[PDB]
Amino acid sequence: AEAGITGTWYNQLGSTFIVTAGADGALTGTYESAVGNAESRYVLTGRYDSAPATDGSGTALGWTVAWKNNYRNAHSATTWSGQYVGGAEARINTQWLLTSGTTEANAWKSTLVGHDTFTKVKP
Amino acid sequence: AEAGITGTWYNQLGSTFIVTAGADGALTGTYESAVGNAESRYVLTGRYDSAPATDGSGTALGWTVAWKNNYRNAHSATTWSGQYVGGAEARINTQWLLTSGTTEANAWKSTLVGHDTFTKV
Amino acid sequence: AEAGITGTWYNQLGSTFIVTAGADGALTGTYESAVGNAESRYVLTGRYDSAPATDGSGTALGWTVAWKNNYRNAHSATTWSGQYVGGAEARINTQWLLTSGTTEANAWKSTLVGHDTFTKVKP
Amino acid sequence: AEAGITGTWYNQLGSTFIVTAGADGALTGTYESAVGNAESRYVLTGRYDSAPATDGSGTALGWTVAWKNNYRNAHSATTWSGQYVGGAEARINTQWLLTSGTTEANAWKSTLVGHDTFTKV
């Protein structure tokens, strides 16, 4: 449901995600990362699957953040693929891939993989 | 390099990606998969990092497709993270994560990881 | 150090890992998984990097479990790549890839990715 | 299929893997990488699942290499998870995770993911 996702979220690393989920399955917002070559907010764009889900199943969603804004250019993009679980303590569990632009030779070391969990605070 | 991301791309599996790259890093288009629980085109939205690149680096980009359209709703989303390379033979090399919405019991086995290489050929 | 790794470990899913770390960097043991197509123990084999690590850095290690024993054959193999952190509450943080043997056509859906954290109980 | 895993393999990067497959699922050998902070051969140990396969499935296998030998100690370990396919042109298709030992601060960026395809060519 767009509503429950829409809000301010923070993860275990201390980063901020402000997102608005549109009725058509769209997600737009700003991301603030507590770590890496990142300063201030960055635009985020993604999609979520408005599931009929009568199973107590999480909603599958994903978003990209290219790390370039008017103050910094990290030359990298992170995609998060995860599941949103609501209820009283709503969480978004994810796994992410962070690709940095590289030369052909160094492409084998371009992607980092990891996992983040977001806890919601405000709508 | 430059506007070269915009176009129609195909991966090893036969899927098609039609993207438009906006001047401030936005990516919009449609995706049609050749494999999996999917049918027709799907809306995709992403971002690419416009940058200086004296060393011939690729352009970092990424996009998401929630597999729900007017025909199917696979209850999943794939994100592709990768980089575009130009030249006579442009290509987008990516690694993707596909997450399906599971119940708590099955969360351990919710995410598939893989890799696709797209060319305009 | 071989010693601290050697012992009984359990993860958030409730699986057992009994391992003995050899001085040469070898790891052998039995794994008992609380989930998936698995029954009773399975042989595990891996390696760990006997780091001089004066930084409070984790020890990098990895191991494979092919899921075939005398009672079941799951036709799959899981590799865990992680870091061992000791101290009073020693943990092994990992990320894993689970590949199932597939036909050529279905190879794009052969690998699962996830992450497990093990808490130690006994040497 | 059968003992065909045993041999000398090479991946796209030019690395070499020499493995021996034991009858009860063990894998032993050496690995020499062509890229990264590595020098010479390294001990590898793994497992492969010996099975029935009426549908022409690959053989699931996996192995670990801790990048420490008498020459270097990169303080990391790579695990390859994948499957072997036989036929006139045998290949081992894998996805790998490389974890480096970080301090707590850097744990988020400790693991590289990638993919290699090995052939006896």
Ligand SMILES: N=C1N[C@H]2[C@H](CS[C@H]2CCCCC(=O)O)N1
């Ligand atoms: N909140 C998070 N921060 C790190 C992880 C994945 S994205 C990452 C920060 C990256 C900042 C930009 C960069 O260093 O390239 N999640």
Ligand SMILES: N=C1N[C@H]2[C@H](CS[C@H]2CCCCC(=O)O)N1
């Ligand atoms: N073009 C590609 N198709 C598969 C991979 C990445 S996503 C995938 C298709 C998944 C379809 C929907 C599903 O079955 O969940 N590349």
Ligand SMILES: N=C1N[C@H]2[C@H](CS[C@H]2CCCCC(=O)O)N1
């Ligand atoms: N302790 C764990 N159990 C699951 C994860 C990764 S391995 C997995 C169990 C797999 C059992 C065999 C199978 O289902 O193929 N960790």
Ligand SMILES: N=C1N[C@H]2[C@H](CS[C@H]2CCCCC(=O)O)N1
């Ligand atoms: N043959 C391959 N070499 C690279 C990939 C997987 S592991 C890697 C080399 C890493 C060397 C040690 C290091 O730099 O950490 N495939």
